Write an enzyme that holds these catalytic residues in place. Structure first.
Site, short mmCIF file in Angstrom:
data_model
loop_
_atom_site.label_atom_id
_atom_site.label_comp_id
_atom_site.label_asym_id
_atom_site.label_seq_id
_atom_site.Cartn_x
_atom_site.Cartn_y
_atom_site.Cartn_z
N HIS G 200 0.80 -1.23 0.00
CA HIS G 200 0.00 0.00 0.00
C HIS G 200 0.83 1.28 0.00
N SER G 204 -1.18 -0.55 -6.71
CA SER G 204 -1.18 -1.65 -7.67
C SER G 204 -0.72 -1.23 -9.06
N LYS G 226 -16.57 -6.59 -6.61
CA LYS G 226 -15.86 -7.47 -7.54
C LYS G 226 -15.24 -8.68 -6.82
N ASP G 227 -14.57 -8.44 -5.69
CA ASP G 227 -13.97 -9.53 -4.94
C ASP G 227 -15.02 -10.44 -4.32
N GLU G 270 1.80 -35.59 -3.66
CA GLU G 270 0.64 -34.76 -3.96
C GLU G 270 0.91 -33.94 -5.21
C1 HEM Z 1 -0.21 -16.68 1.42
C2 HEM Z 1 0.33 -16.23 0.28
C3 HEM Z 1 -0.03 -14.85 -0.31
C4 HEM Z 1 -1.03 -14.03 0.02
C5 HEM Z 1 -2.12 -14.26 1.09
C6 HEM Z 1 -0.94 -12.85 -0.82
C7 HEM Z 1 -1.79 -11.77 -0.80
C8 HEM Z 1 -1.77 -10.72 -1.70
C9 HEM Z 1 -2.84 -9.77 -1.93
C10 HEM Z 1 -4.19 -9.74 -1.20
C11 HEM Z 1 -2.46 -8.91 -2.87
C12 HEM Z 1 -3.32 -7.73 -3.39
C13 HEM Z 1 -3.25 -7.56 -4.91
C14 HEM Z 1 -3.67 -8.81 -5.62
O1 HEM Z 1 -4.55 -9.54 -5.10
O2 HEM Z 1 -3.13 -9.07 -6.73
C15 HEM Z 1 -1.12 -9.29 -3.28
C16 HEM Z 1 -0.34 -8.67 -4.23
C17 HEM Z 1 0.90 -9.09 -4.64
N1 HEM Z 1 1.51 -10.29 -4.30
FE1 HEM Z 1 0.98 -11.49 -2.76
N2 HEM Z 1 0.14 -13.00 -1.65
C18 HEM Z 1 0.73 -14.22 -1.37
C19 HEM Z 1 1.84 -14.74 -1.98
C20 HEM Z 1 2.61 -14.11 -2.92
C21 HEM Z 1 3.66 -14.72 -3.70
C22 HEM Z 1 4.01 -16.21 -3.55
C23 HEM Z 1 4.17 -13.77 -4.51
C24 HEM Z 1 5.31 -13.82 -5.56
C25 HEM Z 1 6.15 -14.84 -5.75
C26 HEM Z 1 3.45 -12.54 -4.24
C27 HEM Z 1 3.67 -11.33 -4.84
C28 HEM Z 1 2.75 -10.31 -4.92
C29 HEM Z 1 2.90 -9.08 -5.66
C30 HEM Z 1 4.14 -8.70 -6.48
C31 HEM Z 1 1.80 -8.35 -5.49
C32 HEM Z 1 1.48 -6.96 -6.08
C33 HEM Z 1 1.56 -7.01 -7.60
C34 HEM Z 1 0.71 -5.94 -8.23
O3 HEM Z 1 -0.07 -5.26 -7.51
O4 HEM Z 1 0.80 -5.76 -9.47
N3 HEM Z 1 2.51 -12.78 -3.27
N4 HEM Z 1 -0.74 -10.40 -2.55
O1 LIG Z 2 -8.21 -7.51 -2.36
C1 LIG Z 2 -7.36 -6.49 -2.22
C2 LIG Z 2 -6.91 -6.14 -0.97
C3 LIG Z 2 -7.39 -6.72 0.32
C4 LIG Z 2 -8.91 -6.63 0.48
C5 LIG Z 2 -9.34 -7.13 1.86
C6 LIG Z 2 -8.87 -8.56 2.10
C7 LIG Z 2 -9.32 -9.11 3.45
C8 LIG Z 2 -9.05 -10.43 3.79
C9 LIG Z 2 -9.43 -10.94 5.02
C10 LIG Z 2 -10.10 -10.12 5.91
CL1 LIG Z 2 -10.59 -10.76 7.45
C11 LIG Z 2 -10.38 -8.81 5.60
C12 LIG Z 2 -9.99 -8.31 4.37
C13 LIG Z 2 -7.36 -8.64 1.93
C14 LIG Z 2 -6.94 -8.16 0.54
C15 LIG Z 2 -5.87 -5.10 -0.86
O2 LIG Z 2 -5.36 -4.78 0.21
C16 LIG Z 2 -5.40 -4.39 -2.13
O3 LIG Z 2 -4.55 -3.50 -2.03
C17 LIG Z 2 -5.97 -4.79 -3.40
C18 LIG Z 2 -5.58 -4.15 -4.57
C19 LIG Z 2 -6.14 -4.50 -5.78
C20 LIG Z 2 -7.10 -5.50 -5.84
C21 LIG Z 2 -7.50 -6.15 -4.68
C22 LIG Z 2 -6.94 -5.80 -3.45
#
Ligand code: HEM
Ligand SMILES: O=C1C(=C2CCC(c3ccc(Cl)cc3)CC2)C(O)=C(O)c2ccccc21
Ligand SMILES: CCCCCCCCCCCCCCCCCC(=O)OC[C@H](COP(=O)([O-])OCC(O)COP(=O)([O-])OC[C@@H](COC(=O)CCCCCCCCCCCCCCCCC)OC(=O)CCCCCCCCCCCCCCCCC)OC(=O)CCCCCCCCCCCCCCCCC
Ligand SMILES: CCCCCCCC/C=C/CCCCCCCC(=O)OC[C@H](COP(=O)(O)OCCN)OC(=O)CCCCCCC/C=C/CCCCCCCC
Ligand SMILES: CCCCCCCC/C=C/CCCCCCCC(=O)OC[C@H](COP(=O)(O)OCCN)OC(=O)CCCCCCC/C=C/CCCCCCCC
Ligand SMILES: CCCCCCCC/C=C/CCCCCCCC(=O)OC[C@H](COP(=O)(O)OCCN)OC(=O)CCCCCCC/C=C/CCCCCCCC
Ligand SMILES: CCCCCCCC/C=C\CCCCCCCC(=O)OC[C@H](COP(=O)(O)OCCN)OC(=O)CCCCCCC/C=C/CCCCCCCC
Ligand code: HEC
Ligand code: HEM
Ligand code: HEM
Ligand code: HEM
Ligand SMILES: O=C1C(=C2CCC(c3ccc(Cl)cc3)CC2)C(O)=C(O)c2ccccc21
Ligand SMILES: O=C1C(O)=C([C@H]2CC[C@H](c3ccc(Cl)cc3)CC2)C(=O)c2ccccc21
Ligand SMILES: O=C1C(O)=C([C@H]2CC[C@H](c3ccc(Cl)cc3)CC2)C(=O)c2ccccc21
Ligand code: FES
Ligand SMILES: [Zn+2]
Lengths: 67, 45, 164, 81, 56, 239, 378, 54, 54, 54
Positions: G200, G204, G226-227, G270
Site C-alpha cells: 500500500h 497496484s 468485484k472480490d 501430492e
Molecule cells: C499466502 C500467500 C499470499 C497471500 C495471502 C498474498 C496476498 C496478496 C494480496 C491480497 C495482494 C493484493 C493484490 C492482488 O490480489 O493481486 C497481493 C499482491 C501481490 N503479491 Fe501477494 N500473496 C501471497 C503470496 C505471494 C507470492 C508467492 C508472490 C510472488 C512470488 C506474491 C507477490 C505479490 C505481488 C508482487 C503483489 C502486487 C503485484 C501488483 O499489484 O501488481 N505474493 N498479494
Molecule cells: O483484495 C485487495 C486487498 C485486500 C482486500 C481485503 C482482504 C481481506 C481479507 C481478510 C479479511 Cl478478514 C479482511 C480483508 C485482503 C486483501 C488489498 O489490500 C489491495 O490492495 C488490493 C488491490 C487490488 C485489488 C485487490 C486488493
C-alpha cells in the site's frame, strides 16, 4: 441345479471377431512354447491380450441378467 | 467534471429536482434552506 | 428503485440460508460423538454391603452410592420438619425399602463428590465449597440448591437390585 | 501519503456520467459484446495455442513409446534356438 | 398515475432500511421451508425403492 | 503388469443415485458366512447397521450371536460375555504373526477400506473374485499359489473363495457365483463410505443455492460498474 | 471529520480498504490475492476443529481420522473441506505468481521478496500436514524429506538424527510435525500483513504497465463487490469438488496404514509437488539434485535483476509472450513426468525439460528483451 | 528519549527477574508445589481438602 | 535523513523505542510491563518445547 | 481509557490460559478443577446445562 449367467455370456462374447483373432494368436503361441526343447519364453502376454478383449464385452452385458 | 489543477480553488454545485413556481411546498423548503444557510471559504443554498 | 432493491433482497435471502447451514453443522461438530452415548444398566449384589456401609460404583461415568441404613437412621430421618428445607421432601418419597437408599453421588452445586459419614447431619459432606447432606440425601447446609438425585431402579432379588 | 487530494497535475479534461438507475446493466450483448470477444480471441490465438499443441504431441508420443517398451520382442527367443 | 407493482414495493417496503431488513428476515423464514421440501421431494423421487425409510 | 479392469454398470455410480440396500443386506451375509474367516473389518460395529438394513432390536440380535472378552471382574480375572451394539466385528486372529502362520506366510488385509485402497475400486474386486483360471503354457506356480490375471504378479495366495451355492440368501435370490460377487462388492462399497447417500442428498440443495447466487451478484456488480462503463471524456485545451 | 478518519485503527482500515486509490483498469488476474487470504482463513478454521479429534501418536493417528470420518457429526465434510481447500490454495498461489511474472509487478521489490518467503512457508506447511495421517505414502514422504539434509557435507547426518530424535523415523518425529504444522499458519498470517503494508506504500500495477495516477478510483464500492463475486465463484467450485466428486484428486495408497518394512512399487507425491519431484529425479548426483531442487524456486529472486526492457508489461511485447507460454508448457511437462515411472523415455524428457526451464529464465528472456529494444529503436 | 535511559533501566529489571527466577527454579523448586497433584485422577473420589493454585 | 527514519517498519520501531519521548521521573513501578512481555515470551518458548513430548 | 480497557481484556485472557494449562497433567486436583470450572455455566437459567454438555 443353477447355471451361472456369466458362463453363457462368456461363451457368447467369445464368438466375436476381435476375440477370435486373439484366440488364434494364443493357440499359435501355445504351439511354439510346447514344441521346443529348452526355452525361457512363456505364453502369458497373449492370454492377457485375449482376456482384455473378451472382458471388455462381458462388462456391457452381464449385469442385465443379475439382480 | 471539468478538471484544471491550476485554478486556486474548487467550485462545486449539487442539486435535486424542485417542484416549480405553482406548488405550495416551496414555502416549507425555503424554511429548510434558512436553517442550513467552519471548513471552507464560501457556501450557499 | 423498487426493482433494483428487490434483486438485493433476494440475493441476501439466499446468502442467509447458506450461512445458517454452514455455521450450524460446524457447531454440531462439537457435540457428543456416536461412540460416547452408550447407556447400560447395572446390577448390584446387596449381600456384600454391611449395615452402615456406603458403597460407590462407577456408572455412566459417575459414582453411584448404595447405602444400607441402620434403624436409628431410619427413625431420625423421618422426624425432620419439611418446612425447614430448601427442597422439601419426605424420606419415603425417596426410598423403596427403608433400609436401602440409592443415590447419584454428584454434588448439585458444582459437581464434586460428597464424602460419606461426615458433616453435621450424619449423611455426606462436600469438601469443595462446604455443603452438608443427610442420610436421605437432602441438602441441609451450604450453597447447593437441590437434593441428591435418585435414579430409576427395582429389586430383582431380596439380594439383587438393578439400576437403569 | 498517497491520497485523493494530490496524486497528479492535470488540466483541461472534461468527463460525463449517468447514474446507474438511469441506464441498463447489460445494454448490448449479442450486437456488440460477442464480436468483441471474437476479435479478442483472434488477437491472441497464435501467441498461445501452438506451444500447447506441441505439448500435446510430446505427451502422446512419450506415452506410446513407453507402452511399446513393455511388449515382448519375438527375436529375444526366436533368434538362436 | 400508474400505480405499478415495483413502485408500490419500493414505497411500502424498501424505502426505509429497518423495514427492508424486516422484509428480508420474513422472506428467509418461508423460503427455507419451501426450498427444503422441494429438494427432499426431488431426491426421494430420483431413487424410489432404494431408501430404507420406505423398505422399513 | 496388471490387467486393467473394465467398467461395470453399477447402479450407484450416477451423480445422484443411491446405493441398493437390498444388495448391502445380502453382501453382509456373504461377509459373515465366508469372508470373515480370514479377514478383519476393524472399523465397523453392529450399531452401524442400525437404520441401514436393520432395526435396533435385530442388530442387537446379530450382536448376541458372538462371544466377546470382557473384564476384569471383581476378582481381577477376564471372562466371556455375549455381544452388544457397541462391540466391533470380531477379529479372526489375535495377531498378524498368527494370521501369517495360518495362511502359509501371507497376511490377509483388512477389508474396511479395501474399496478405496485399490486402483479401480469395486471394478477390481469383482474382477478378482470372478477371474481365476488355469495358467498359460510356460508358467509355473510355487507351493500354495494360484493363478489370477487381475493380481499384480498373477500369483496369489488366496484360493478361489466363492462358488455357486456356497451360501443361501434369506430373500430367496439364486446364489450363483456372479450374484454373490456383485452383492459382497456392494457391501464393501457401503463399508468404505457410509456418508454416500446423505452426501448426494446434500449436494442437490447447496449446489442449487451456490448456482443461484452467481447471476445475482453479477447483476449487482454490473449495476455498480455501469457508471464507469458508459463514461465519456473530452480534451479542451485553450489552444 | 467523519468517524471514518477519527482514530488510528479506523484510519488504517480506511487507508487499507475504503478510500485506497486503486487502478480503474485491472482485470480478473488481480482477484487471486483475496482468494488466497480467504483460503488461509478457511484452513485455519477447519484445522482448529480437526485438531480437537486427532491423535499425534503413531499407534492411533490413522484410527483417529477413521473416528473423525465415521462417528463425528459431519466430520467427513470438515475433512473433505480441509483437504480440498489446500488444493485450491495452491491453484490460486500459482496463478498469483504467474500474473506478476507476465505483467512485470516484480519491480515492486519488497512485495516480491515477501511473496517468495510466503511461498516457501506455505509449502513447508502443506507438506507437514500431508504426513499426519500416517498412511503408507505419508511415511515414505516424511522419510525422504527428512533425509534431504544428509546432503550437507560436514554436518548433515547429524542434522538428520537431531530432527528425528532417534535412530529412525518414529513417534518422536510425528509430534514435531504436528507442533510445527500447528504454529506455521499464524506466522504466515503475520507475514501476509507485512506484505500488504509494503504494497500500500506504492499501489497496484496494472495491465498496460503505465502510470495510472490520472484514473484512480476508490476501492469501495467497486472492488469490494468485484472480490465478493470472485469469492462466490470460488465457493461454487469448492462445494462441487467437496460433494459431487470428492475422490477426483484422492490417492488410494494413503488408505493403507504405514509399514516401515516395505516401500510400494509406484511412488507419487501430492500433485502440487510433482514438478519439484521431477527436477529432483533428473540429476544423477545427490548433492546436485538437492541443489537444483531448491534453486528451482530460489531463482525467482534474481528476475528483477535480469530485466532489460524499457517497458514493464508484456502486453505490448509479443516475442516475450511467446517465450512466457513456452515456459508454462515446460512446467506442465515436468508435472506430467513426475507422475510416470522412472523409465528411460521419461528420464530423457525430464532432463530436457529441466535444462530448458533454467535456460529460459536465465538466458532467452534477457536476449529477446534486447532484440525487442533494438526493433523499437532505443 | 527512551534510548539510552530506559533501555538500560529495563535491562537491569530483567537481570533482577532472572536472578529471582533461577533461585526459585534451582534452589527451592518445591516452595509453591502441591502434593495432591502428584496423585493421578480418580473420578470416584474428591479429596477432603481442596485448594486451587495460589 | 538517517536510516532510522527512512522506512515505515524502521520508523515505527523508532517511534516505539528509540526516539519516543518518556517522562524523566517515572519510578520502578513502570518496569513491570516489560517484565510481563518477557514472561509471555518465556512461556511461549518453553511451551513449544514441552508440547513436543506431551 | 483505551489502554485500561485493553488491560482488562488481557487480564481475563491470561486467567483463562493459566487455568486451561493447570488441568493438563490430569492429576487429582486438575480433574476436580476442570469439573468445577465447566459446571460454572449451569448457573445460566435457560440454556446452562446444555452449554455444559456441549
Ligand atoms: C499466502 C500467500 C499470499 C497471500 C495471502 C498474498 C496476498 C496478496 C494480496 C491480497 C495482494 C493484493 C493484490 C492482488 O490480489 O493481486 C497481493 C499482491 C501481490 N503479491 Fe501477494 N500473496 C501471497 C503470496 C505471494 C507470492 C508467492 C508472490 C510472488 C512470488 C506474491 C507477490 C505479490 C505481488 C508482487 C503483489 C502486487 C503485484 C501488483 O499489484 O501488481 N505474493 N498479494
Ligand atoms: O483484495 C485487495 C486487498 C485486500 C482486500 C481485503 C482482504 C481481506 C481479507 C481478510 C479479511 Cl478478514 C479482511 C480483508 C485482503 C486483501 C488489498 O489490500 C489491495 O490492495 C488490493 C488491490 C487490488 C485489488 C485487490 C486488493
Ligand atoms: C534461599 C533463598 C535466598 C534468596 C536471596 C534473595 C536475595 C535478593 C537480593 C536483592 C537485591 C536487590 C538490589 C536492587 C538494587 C536496585 C537499585 C534501585 O534503583 O532501587 C530503586 C528501588 C526503589 O525505587 P524508587 O524509584 O525509589 O520507587 C519506589 C517508591 O516509589 C519510592 O517511594 P517512597 O520513597 O515513598 O518509599 C520509601 C519507603 C517506603 O517505606 C514504607 O512504606 C515504610 C516501611 C516500614 C517498614 C518497617 C519495618 C517492617 C514493619 C514493622 C512494623 C511494626 C510491627 C509491629 C508488630 C506488633 C505485633 C503485636 O520504601 C523504601 O525505601 C523501600 C526500600 C527497600 C526495598 C526492599 C525490596 C525488597 C525485595 C525483596 C525480594 C524478595 C524475593 C527474593 C528471592 C527469594 C527466592 C526464594 O529500590 C531501592 O531504592 C532499594 C534498593 C535496595 C533493595 C535491597 C533489597 C534486598 C532484599 C533481600 C531479601 C533477602 C531475603 C529473601 C527471603 C525470601 C523468602 C522466600
Ligand atoms: C433482545 C433481542 C435482540 C434485540 C436486538 C436489537 C438490535 C437490532 C440490531 C440493531 C443494529 C443497529 C442499528 C442502529 C445503529 C445506529 C448507529 C448510530 O446511531 O451511530 C451512527 C454514528 C455514525 O458515526 P458518524 O459518521 O460520526 O455520524 C455523524 C452523522 N452526521 O455513530 C457511529 O459511529 C456508530 C455507532 C454504532 C453503535 C452501535 C450500537 C449497537 C447496539 C447493539 C445492541 C445489541 C443488544 C443485544 C441484546 C441481546 C440480549 C441480551
Ligand atoms: C488440479 C490440477 C491443477 C493444475 C494446475 C493449474 C494451474 C495452471 C493452469 C495453466 C493454464 C492457464 C491458462 C490461463 C488462461 C490463458 C488465456 C490466454 O492465453 O489469454 C492471453 C491474454 C492476453 O492478454 P494481454 O497480453 O494482457 O492483452 C490483452 C489486452 N489487449 O491474457 C494473458 O496473457 C494474461 C496472462 C496472465 C498470467 C497467466 C498465468 C497462467 C499460468 C500460471 C501458473 C503456471 C505455473 C507457475 C508459473 C510460475 C513458476 C515460477
Ligand atoms: C566465515 C565465518 C564467519 C565470518 C563472519 C564475519 C562477520 C562478523 C560480524 C560482522 C558484523 C558487521 C560489522 C560491520 C557492519 C557494517 C555496516 C555498514 O557498513 O552499514 C552501516 C550503514 C548505517 O546506515 P546509515 O545510518 O544510513 O549510514 C550513514 C552514515 N553517515 O548501513 C546500514 O544501514 C547498515 C547495513 C548493515 C549491513 C550488515 C551486513 C552483515 C553481513 C553479515 C555476513 C555474515 C556471513 C556469515 C557467513 C557464515 C558462513 C557461511
Ligand atoms: C458462509 C458461506 C456463505 C456463502 C454465500 C456467499 C457469502 C458472501 C456474500 C457477500 C457477503 C458480504 C459481506 C461484506 C459486506 C458487503 C456490504 C455491501 O456490499 O454493501 C455495502 C453496504 C455499505 O453501504 P453504502 O451504501 O456503501 O454506504 C451508505 C452510507 N449512507 O454495506 C452495508 O450494508 C453495511 C451495513 C451492514 C450490513 C450488514 C453486514 C453483515 C452483517 C449483518 C447480519 C448480522 C448478523 C451476522 C451473524 C453471523 C453469524 C454469527
Ligand atoms: C482364507 C481361506 C480366506 C478367505 C475365506 C478369504 N480370503 Fe481374502 N485373502 C486371503 C489371503 C491369504 C490373502 C493374501 C493374498 C496375497 O497374495 O497376499 C487374501 C487377499 C485378499 C484381497 C487382496 C487383493 C489384493 O490385490 O491385495 C482381497 C481384496 C480379498 N482377499 C478379498 C476377499 C473376499 C471378498 C473374500 C470373501 C468372498 C475373501 N477374501 C475370503 C485369504 C482368504
Ligand atoms: C496454510 C494453512 C494450512 C494448510 C495448507 C494445511 C494443509 C494440510 C493438509 C494438506 C493436510 C492433510 C490432508 C489430508 O491428509 O487429507 C492437513 C492436515 C491437518 N491439518 Fe492442516 N493445513 C493448514 C492449517 C492448519 C491449522 C492452522 C491447523 C491447526 C491445528 C491444522 C490442523 C491439521 C490437522 C489436525 C490435520 C490432520 C487431520 C487430517 O489429516 O485430516 N491445519 N493440513
Ligand atoms: C499480558 C499482559 C500485559 C502486558 C504484556 C502489558 C504490557 C504493558 C507495557 C509494556 C506497558 C508500558 C508501560 C509500563 O510498563 O508501565 C504497559 C502500560 C500500561 N498497562 Fe499494560 N500490560 C498488560 C496488562 C495490563 C493490565 C491487566 C492492565 C490494567 C488492568 C494494563 C494497563 C496498563 C496501563 C494503564 C498502562 C499505561 C499506564 C501508564 O503509562 O501510566 N495492562 N503495559
Ligand atoms: C501466557 C502463556 C502461558 C501460560 C500462562 C501457561 C501456563 C501453564 C501452566 C500453569 C501449566 C501447568 C503447569 C504445571 O502443571 O506444572 C502449563 C502447562 C503446559 N503448557 Fe503452558 N502456558 C503458557 C503458554 C504455553 C504455550 C504457548 C504452549 C504451546 C504449546 C504451552 C504448552 C503447555 C503444555 C504442553 C503444558 C503441559 C506440560 C506440563 O504440564 O508441564 N504453554 N501451562
Ligand atoms: O518498556 C516500555 C515499552 C516497551 C519496551 C520494549 C518491550 C519489548 C518486548 C519484547 C520485544 Cl521482542 C521487544 C521489545 C515492550 C515494552 C514501551 O513501549 C513504553 O512505552 C514504555 C514506557 C515507559 C516505560 C517502559 C516502556
Ligand atoms: O520420493 C519422494 C519424494 O522425492 C518426495 C519429494 C517431493 C518434493 C518435495 C519438495 C521439497 C522442497 C520443495 Cl521447495 C518443494 C517440494 C520433497 C519431497 C515426496 O514428496 C514423496 C512422497 C511420498 C513418497 C515418496 C516421495
Ligand atoms: O472448588 C474449586 C474451585 O471453586 C475452583 C475455582 C477457583 C476460581 C476459578 C476462577 C474462575 C474465574 C475467574 Cl475470572 C477467576 C478464577 C474457577 C475455579 C478451583 O480452581 C478448584 C480447583 C481444584 C479443585 C477444586 C476447585
Ligand atoms: S461442588 Fe459441592 S459444595 Fe460446591
Ligand atoms: Zn449434511
Amino acid at each position: 441345479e443353477l447355471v451361472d449367467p456369466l458362463t453363457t455370456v462368456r461363451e457368447q462374447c467369445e464368438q466375436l471377431e476381435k476375440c477370435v483373432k486373439a484366440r488364434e494368436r494364443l493357440e499359435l503361441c501355445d504351439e511354439r512354447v510346447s514344441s521346443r526343447s529348452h526355452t525361457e519364453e512363456d505364453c502369458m502376454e497373449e492370454l492377457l491380450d485375449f482376456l482384455y478383449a473378451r472382458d471388455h464385452c462381458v462388462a456391457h452385458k452381464l449385469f442385465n441378467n443379475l439382480k | 467534471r471539468h478538471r484544471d489543477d491550476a485554478l486556486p480553488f474548487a467550485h462545486v454545485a449539487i442539486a435535486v429536482e424542485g417542484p416549480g413556481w405553482a406548488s405550495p411546498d416551496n414555502v416549507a423548503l425555503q424554511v429548510a434552506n434558512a436553517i442550513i444557510g467552519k471548513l471552507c471559504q464560501s457556501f450557499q443554498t | 428503485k423498487g426493482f433494483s432493491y428487490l434483486v438485493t433482497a433476494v440475493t441476501t435471502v439466499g446468502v442467509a440460508y447458506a450461512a445458517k447451514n454452514v455455521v450450524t453443522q460446524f457447531i454440531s461438530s462439537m457435540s457428543a460423538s456416536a461412540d460416547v452415548l452408550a447407556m447400560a444398566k447395572i446390577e448390584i449384589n446387596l449381600s456384600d454391603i454391611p449395615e452402615g456401609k456406603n458403597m460407590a460404583f462407577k456408572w455412566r461415568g459417575k459414582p453411584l452410592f448404595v447405602r444400607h441404613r441402620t434403624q436409628k437412621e431410619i427413625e431420625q430421618e423421618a422426624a425432620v420438619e419439611l418446612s425447614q428445607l430448601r427442597d422439601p421432601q419426605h424420606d419415603l418419597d425417596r426410598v423403596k425399602k427403608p433400609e436401602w437408599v440409592i443415590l447419584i453421588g454428584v454434588c448439585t452445586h458444582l459437581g464434586c463428590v460428597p464424602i460419606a459419614n461426615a458433616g453435621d447431619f450424619g449423611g455426606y459432606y462436600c469438601p469443595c465449597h462446604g455443603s452438608h447432606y443427610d442420610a436421605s440425601g437432602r441438602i441441609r447446609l451450604g450453597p447447593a440448591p437441590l437434593n441428591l438425585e435418585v435414579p430409576p431402579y427395582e429389586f430383582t432379588r431380596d439380594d439383587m437390585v438393578v439400576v437403569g | 501519503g498517497r491520497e485523493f487530494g494530490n496524486l497528479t497535475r492535470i488540466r483541461h479534461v472534461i468527463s460525463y456520467s449517468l447514474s446507474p438507475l438511469e441506464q441498463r446493466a447489460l445494454p448490448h450483448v449479442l450486437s456488440k459484446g460477442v464480436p468483441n470477444m471474437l476479435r479478442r480471441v483472434r488477437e491472441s490465438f497464435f501467441r498461445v495455442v501452438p506451444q500447447f499443441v506441441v505439448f500435446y504431441l510430446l505427451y502422446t508420443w512419450g506415452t506410446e513409446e513407453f507402452e511399446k517398451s513393455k511388449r515382448k520382442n519375438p527375436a529375444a527367443y526366436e533368434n538362436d534356438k | 398515475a400508474a400505480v405499478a407493482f415495483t413502485s408500490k414495493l419500493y414505497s411500502l417496503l424498501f424505502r426505509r432500511t429497518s423495514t427492508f431488513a424486516l422484509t428480508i428476515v420474513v422472506g428467509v423464514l418461508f423460503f427455507e421451508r419451501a426450498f427444503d421440501q422441494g429438494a427432499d421431494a426431488i431426491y426421494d423421487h430420483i431413487n424410489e425403492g432404494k431408501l430404507w425409510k420406505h423398505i422399513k | 503388469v496388471a490387467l486393467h479392469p473394465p467398467s461395470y454398470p453399477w447402479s450407484h455410480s450416477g451423480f445422484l443415485s443411491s446405493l441398493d440396500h437390498t444388495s448391502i443386506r445380502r453382501g453382509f451375509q456373504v461377509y459373515k458366512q465366508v469372508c470373515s474367516s480370514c479377514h478383519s473389518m476393524n472399523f465397523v460395529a453392529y450399531r452401524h447397521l442400525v437404520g441401514v438394513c436393520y432395526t435396533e432390536d435385530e442388530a442387537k440380535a446379530l450382536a448376541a450371536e458372538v462371544e466377546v472378552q470382557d473384564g476384569p471382574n471383581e476378582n481381577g480375572e477376564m471372562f466371556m460375555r455375549p455381544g452388544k451394539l457397541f462391540d466391533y466385528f470380531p477379529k479372526p486372529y489375535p495377531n498378524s504373526e498368527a494370521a501369517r502362520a495360518a495362511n502359509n506366510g501371507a497376511l490377509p488385509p483388512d477389508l474396511s477400506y479395501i474399496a478405496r485402497a485399490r486402483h479401480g475400486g469395486e471394478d477390481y474386486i469383482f474382477s478378482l473374485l470372478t477371474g481365476y483360471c488355469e495358467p498359460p503354457t510356460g508358467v509355473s506356480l510355487r507351493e500354495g499359489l494360484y493363478f489370477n490375471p487381475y493380481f499384480p504378479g498373477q500369483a496369489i495366495a488366496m484360493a478361489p473363495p466363492i462358488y455357486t451355492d456356497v451360501l443361501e440368501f434369506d430373500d430367496g435370490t439364486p446364489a450363483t457365483m456372479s450374484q454373490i460377487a456383485k452383492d459382497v462388492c456392494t457391501f464393501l462399497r457401503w463399508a468404505s463410505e457410509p456418508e454416500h447417500d446423505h452426501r448426494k442428498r446434500m449436494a442437490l440443495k447447496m449446489l442449487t443455492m451456490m448456482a443461484l447466487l452467481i447471476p445475482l451478484t453479477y447483476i449487482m456488480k454490473r449495476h455498480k460498474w455501469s457508471v464507469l462503463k458508459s463514461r465519456k471524456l473530452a480534451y479542451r485545451p485553450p489552444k | 471529520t467523519p468517524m471514518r478518519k477519527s482514530n488510528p485503527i479506523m484510519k488504517m482500515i480506511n487507508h487499507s480498504l475504503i478510500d485506497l486509490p486503486t487502478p480503474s483498469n485491472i482485470s480478473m488476474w488481480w482477484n487471486f490475492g483475496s482468494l488466497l487470504a480467504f483460503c488461509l482463513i478457511l484452513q485455519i478454521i477447519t484445522g482448529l476443529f480437526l485438531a480437537m479429534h486427532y491423535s499425534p501418536d503413531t499407534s492411533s493417528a490413522f484410527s483417529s481420522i477413521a473416528h473423525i470420518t465415521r462417528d463425528v457429526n459431519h466430520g467427513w465434510i470438515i475433512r473433505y473441506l480441509h483437504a480440498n481447500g489446500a488444493s485450491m490454495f495452491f491453484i490460486c498461489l500459482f496463478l498469483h505468481v504467474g500474473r506478476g511474472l507476465y505483467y512485470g509487478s516484480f519491480l515492486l521489490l519488497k512485495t516480491w521478496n515477501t511473496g517468495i518467503m510466503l511461498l516457501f512457508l506455505t509449502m513447508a506447511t502443506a507438506f507437514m500436514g500431508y504426513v499426519l495421517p500416517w498412511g503408507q505414502m505419508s511415511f515414505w514422504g516424511a522419510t525422504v524429506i527428512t533425509n534431504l539434509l544428509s546432503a550437507i557435507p560436514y554436518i548433515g547426518t547429524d542434522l538428520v538424527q537431531w530432527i528425528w530424535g532417534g535412530y529412525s523415523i518414529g513417534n518422536p518425529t510425528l509430534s514435531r510435525f504436528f507442533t510445527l504444522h500447528f504454529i506455521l499458519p499464524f506466522i504466515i498470517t503475520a507475514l501476509t500483513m507485512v506484505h500488504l503494508l509494503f504494497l500500500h506504500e506504492t499501489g497496484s500495477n496494472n495491465p498496460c504497465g503505465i502510470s495510472s495516477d490520472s484514473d484512480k478510483i476508490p476501492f469501495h464500492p467497486y472492488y469490494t463487490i468485484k472480490d465478493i463475486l470472485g469469492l462466490v465463484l470460488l465457493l461454487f467450485i469448492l462445494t462441487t469438488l467437496t460433494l459431487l466428486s470428492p475422490n477426483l484428486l484422492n490417492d488410494p495408497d494413503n488408505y493403507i496404514p504405514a509399514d516401515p518394512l516395505n516401500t510400494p512399487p509406484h511412488i507419487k507425491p501430492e500433485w502440487y509437488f510433482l514438478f519439484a519431484y521431477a527436477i529432483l529425479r533428473s540429476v544423477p548426483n545427490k548433492l546436485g539434485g538437492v541443489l537444483a531442487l531448491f534453486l528451482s524456486i530460489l531463482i525467482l529472486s534474481i528476475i528483477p535483476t535480469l530485466h532489460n526492457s524499457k517497458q514493464q508489461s508484456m502486453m505490448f511485447r509479443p516475442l516475450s509472450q511467446f517465450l512466457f507460454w513456452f515456459l508454462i508448457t515446460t512446467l506442465l511437462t515436468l508435472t506430467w513426468i513426475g507422475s510416470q515411472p522412472v523409465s528411460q523415455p521419461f528420464i530423457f524428457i525430464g532432463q530436457l525439460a529441466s535444462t530448458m526451464y533454467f535456460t529460459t529464465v536465465l538466458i532467452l528472456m534477457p536476449l529477446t528483451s534486447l532484440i525487442e529494444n533494438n526493433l523499437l529503436k532505443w
